Design a binder for these strands. Sequence first.
RNA 1: UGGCCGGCAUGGUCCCAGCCUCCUCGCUGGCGCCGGCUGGGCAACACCAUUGCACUCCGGUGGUGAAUGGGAC
Length: 95
Amino acid sequence: PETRPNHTIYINNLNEKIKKDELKKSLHAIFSRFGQILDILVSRSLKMRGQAFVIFKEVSSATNALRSMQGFPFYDKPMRIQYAKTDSDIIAKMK
RNA sequence: UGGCCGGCAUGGUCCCAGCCUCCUCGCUGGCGCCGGCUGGGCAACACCAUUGCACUCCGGUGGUGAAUGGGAC
Ligand SMILES: [Mg+2]
Ligand SMILES: [Mg+2]
């Protein structure tokens, strides 16, 4: 059951050996070109490691980001991207 | 020594270089041998497990079972 378009993209299959601060920075380095990014959430907990949430201001950016970077080698691993299931709080606090 | 004890061995104080380490990374730390008890913490590092949809920080285990020489008095 695929997911519907969202302001936020959910990425997984990320190298778990990368520290949080660096991961967010590197992610911003490659995704900022698709549009303004409101935030990038990363957690190294047992349940949230290897994944990240990049929150774009406009859905078209998320959609572009998703199509353009699907499978992109990042820290030696093919990035897997999908739309997030539900809106991030930062987005709800508006739209 | 992260805290603590037992056995044995061992002239001294320095000075230069090199090396070691999860627990006060460096020159007013340490760098003989053997044995046993034990605390903290996953922050760093490593290993194991994890492919996971969050917006509440939060899986486990291991390391000292470490490290040489030279010179001056
Ligand atoms: Mg020590
Ligand atoms: Mg950990």
